[PDB]
Write a protein that holds these residues in place. Structure first.
Motif, PDB file in Angstrom:
ATOM      1  N   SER B 114      -6.760 124.276 -34.939  1.00  0.00           N
ATOM      2  CA  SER B 114      -5.465 123.636 -34.808  1.00  0.00           C
ATOM      3  C   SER B 114      -4.600 123.708 -33.191  1.00  0.00           C
ATOM      4  O   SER B 114      -3.727 122.991 -33.127  1.00  0.00           O
ATOM      5  N   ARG B 117      -9.627 121.322 -28.743  1.00  0.00           N
ATOM      6  CA  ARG B 117     -10.748 120.404 -28.788  1.00  0.00           C
ATOM      7  C   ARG B 117     -11.911 120.981 -29.015  1.00  0.00           C
ATOM      8  O   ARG B 117     -12.081 122.425 -29.403  1.00  0.00           O
TER       9      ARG B 117
ATOM     10  N   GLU C  65      -9.466 108.151 -37.903  1.00  0.00           N
ATOM     11  CA  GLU C  65      -9.282 109.551 -37.977  1.00  0.00           C
ATOM     12  C   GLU C  65      -9.195 110.381 -36.861  1.00  0.00           C
ATOM     13  O   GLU C  65      -8.345 110.900 -36.638  1.00  0.00           O
ATOM     14  N   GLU C  70      -6.541 113.036 -32.489  1.00  0.00           N
ATOM     15  CA  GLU C  70      -6.492 113.091 -31.095  1.00  0.00           C
ATOM     16  C   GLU C  70      -5.065 112.897 -30.451  1.00  0.00           C
ATOM     17  O   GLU C  70      -4.424 113.477 -29.623  1.00  0.00           O
ATOM     18  N   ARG C  73      -2.738 115.823 -31.479  1.00  0.00           N
ATOM     19  CA  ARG C  73      -2.951 116.960 -30.709  1.00  0.00           C
ATOM     20  C   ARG C  73      -2.449 116.816 -29.413  1.00  0.00           C
ATOM     21  O   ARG C  73      -1.883 117.685 -28.986  1.00  0.00           O
ATOM     22  N   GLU C  74      -2.585 115.772 -28.544  1.00  0.00           N
ATOM     23  CA  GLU C  74      -2.235 115.459 -27.271  1.00  0.00           C
ATOM     24  C   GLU C  74      -0.567 115.349 -27.404  1.00  0.00           C
ATOM     25  O   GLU C  74      -0.007 116.003 -26.421  1.00  0.00           O
ATOM     26  N   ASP C  77       0.467 118.982 -27.506  1.00  0.00           N
ATOM     27  CA  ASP C  77       0.215 119.743 -26.242  1.00  0.00           C
ATOM     28  C   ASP C  77       1.212 119.311 -25.184  1.00  0.00           C
ATOM     29  O   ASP C  77       1.576 120.043 -24.271  1.00  0.00           O
TER      30      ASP C  77
END
Lengths: 112, 307, 100
Positions: B114, B117, C65, C70, C73-74, C77
């Motif tokens: 989580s 990458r 998916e 991605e 997540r980006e 972050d």
């Protein structure tokens, strides 16, 4: 601890209090031995009451949405009075050209 | 039975989707015999699953019974293992079934999945006779859904999720272990001889990691230390079980009446013989202590113990 | 200018679609095409859609998916590395550390 309650009752109390961290730290612990059809009922109750954190917690703790959601449970979810007010009833009245009797179960065909 | 098993072709291999926790994690799998040639297993893991030869092999051993580790110790173990297996192409060999140290590895991978990458190539070699749902896996060549719900009164266990690949070994029997130790050991032996991309002539370096344990972890550690190439092992101090026994024995090198620890056969037990066969080769065993000694990081501890 | 550019780019779709339905003959010769429609009165592989097989559909689903994972997540972050979040977290940790 002092309620002398089983795991489903503790989960129901945590759902009613809208405290997810208490269920995270105390309730969902190793060897709690949920009975059959208890986590599913918890998922249904958290879905009706709009408790997104509890739905996520139950998802992370075993229940799969593919096996829970059926036609009957979805039809129940469309006919709940718990949660924020919506505008589904007026839409069904408009689609059904009026003459809507009071206390009418909304079928999935009307949703379509 | 007097070992009366029918020789039949494999009817269960493909991909399993773990319906359950909030992740979409696939996992290749295959059902192979209790005694198969490691060349076939290597060919399957290379040409069919499209996996490159590892630059590092981590063999995780531990206790089968479910235990628990105190906080600020599992978070300095799982993160260290994840860093050590992610900064290098590594194959985390594990037991596979969600119990004991395997659960700790699973939640360590869940923490990493989580926040970063990439994928960690975790290979779980589990016996076929302990899966709580043999059905839903008998499907052939096609994706088969699998539920991670745990039934307390099933007298079996479920496949741990967050594993990239599986190798299921069966010897005919169901409901008991013992069908994967020989296969796992022979696979590690055959992969340790495989030449790495460097042309010096060295095989890939393997290492062992020990958390918790029992009367058998001492035997497998002894087997690791006595192989024709010695295999360094890494133990943990905060587990409290036979790993902590190895940590206690590491100190006071070379108090024999202290064997009455009541863990297994409280008195007059013959584990001190193998514990004395070990600690004679006390040049490979590395002990990790949280803040008590050097190498405060697991990834630093594993890599240093390998050179 | 900006509104006109955006509206023209949007109406390009309608311009393309209205020529995919008109008969191939121009208005001076369009009577012949209407006669053909009379004959077809008694009687979409591409242009709008693109039919695909099951394996291609599954490949597209896996790609989508991966893209959405991605993206989330980006986004997380990027949010966790902003100056405001760092200042807030540092302030909270400094307060707790001072109390301790």
């Amino acid at each position: 601890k002092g309620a002398n309650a089983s795991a489903p009752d503790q989960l129901s109390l945590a759902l009613a209090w809208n405290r997810v961290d208490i269920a995270r730290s105390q309730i969902f612990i190793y060897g709690q031995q949920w009975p059959v059809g208890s986590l599913e009922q918890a998922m249904l109750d958290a879905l009706v009451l709009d408790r997104v954190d509890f739905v996520k917690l139950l998802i992370e703790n075993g229940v799969s949405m593919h096996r829970f959601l059926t036609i009957s449970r979805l039809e129940e979810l469309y006919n709940t009075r718990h949660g924020p007010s919506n505008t589904l009833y007026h839409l069904v009245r408009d689609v059904k050209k009026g003459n809507l009797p009071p206390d009418y179960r909304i079928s999935l065909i009307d949703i379509g | 039975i007097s070992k009366h098993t029918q020789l039949s072709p494999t009817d269960a291999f493909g991909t399993i989707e773990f319906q359950g926790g909030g992740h979409s994690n696939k996992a290749m799998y295959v059902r192979v015999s209790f005694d198969t040639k490691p060349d076939l297993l290597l060919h399957l893991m290379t040409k069919e699953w499209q996996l490159e030869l590892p630059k590092l092999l981590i063999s995780v051993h531990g206790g089968l019974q479910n235990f628990e580790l105190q906080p600020k110790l599992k978070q300095v173990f799982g993160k260290g293992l994840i860093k050590a297996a992610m900064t290098t192409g590594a194959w985390i060999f594990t037991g596979g079934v969600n119990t004991g140290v395997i659960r700790h590895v699973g939640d360590a991978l869940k923490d990493h999945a989580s926040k970063s990458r990439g994928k960690i190539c975790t290979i779980g070699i589990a016996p076929w006779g302990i899966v709580e749902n043999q059905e839903d896996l008998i499907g052939r060549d096609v994706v088969r859904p699998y539920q991670t719900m745990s039934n307390p009164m099933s007298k079996l266990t479920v496949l741990n999720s967050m594993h990239s690949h599986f190798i299921l070994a069966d010897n005919g029997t169901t409901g008991k272990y013992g069908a994967e130790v020989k296969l796992r050991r022979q696979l590690e032996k055959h992969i340790s001889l495989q030449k790495i991309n460097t042309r010096i002539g060295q095989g890939v370096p393997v290492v062992a990691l020990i958390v918790e344990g029992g009367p058998n972890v001492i035997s497998i550690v002894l087997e690791y230390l006595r192989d024709t190439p010695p295999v360094p092992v890494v133990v943990c101090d905060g587990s409290g079980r036979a790993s902590d026994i190895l940590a206690f024995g590491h100190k006071y090198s070379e108090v024999t009446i202290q064997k009455t620890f009541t863990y297994t056969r409280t008195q007059a037990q013959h584990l001190f013989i193998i514990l004395m066969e070990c600690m004679k080769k006390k040049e490979l065993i590395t002990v990790f202590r949280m803040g008590s000694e050097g190498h405060q990081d697991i990834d630093l501890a594993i890599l240093t113990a390998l050179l | 200018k900006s509104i006109s550019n955006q509206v023209w780019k949007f109406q390009r779709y309608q311009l393309i679609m209205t020529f995919h339905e008109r008969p191939v003959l121009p208005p001076p010769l369009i009577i012949f095409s209407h006669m053909t429609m009379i004959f077809q009165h008694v009687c979409r592989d591409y242009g709008l859609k693109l039919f695909i097989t099951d394996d291609e559909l599954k490949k597209v689903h896996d790609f989508e998916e991966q893209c959405i994972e991605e993206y989330f997540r980006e986004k997380d972050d990027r949010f966790n590395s902003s100056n405001d979040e760092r200042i807030r977290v540092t302030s909270e940790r400094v307060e707790n550390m001072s109390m301790r």
